[PDB]
Amino acid sequence: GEWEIIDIGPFTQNLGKFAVDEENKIGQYGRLTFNKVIRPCMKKTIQQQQGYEYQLYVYASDKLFRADISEDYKTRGRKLLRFNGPVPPP
Amino acid sequence: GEWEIIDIGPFTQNLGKFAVDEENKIGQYGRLTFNKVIRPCMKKTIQQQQGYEYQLYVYASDKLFRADISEDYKTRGRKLLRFNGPVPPP
């Protein structure tokens, strides 16, 4: 959804320390030491949606395609999200 | 993030026509003619999420990393989604 550039302050600095500390628990990069958070820092808003997503193998014009359709839970309205192909038979 | 397979009944076939009808509105693959939907047809349940995502450039051990942090809106709890690098300065 909406994207926003957030200021570089104590809150963003604590986020960096939170990420590095959580990454050290995994140990993928060993034991890192947090230095600082630099610009740009981005804040993306996540919009909620409750429903289903049907992922189908469809034959169109004698070719196999991969189509993804979203459907809202309360409204049951659907939207085509993706349509790719041809793809090999599963 | 729950998954479930659904049959290729009348409901599943109807989704094929809606998908082919929509892609023809776009027209990337010409004027398609719907044939049929085959197995397997997968149905992913989407559960709503209300919050933000922080995408940060973090200096750790003098190396540049890119970290993504999620924050729930109703609870304000945060999670490290991805931590990769080193990456060049933006």
Curated annotation (Swiss-Prot), chains A, B:
InterPro entries: Cystatin_sf, Monellin, Monellin_B, Sweet-Taste_Mod_sf. Taste-modifying protein; intensely sweet-tasting protein. The keyword S-adenosyl-L-methionine does not apply. It comes from Dioscoreophyllum cumminsii. Gene3D superfamilies: 6.10.140.2000. Signal peptide: none annotated. SUPFAM superfamilies: Cystatin/monellin (SSF54403). The record marks C41 as: Blocking, abolishes the sweet taste. This is Monellin chain B. The keyword Isomerase does not apply. It holds the Pfam family Monellin. Natural monellin has not been mass marketed to the food industry, primarily due to the challenge of large-scale purification of the protein which is relatively sensitive to heat or acid treatment. Keywords: Taste-modifying protein. Heterodimer of an A chain and a B chain.
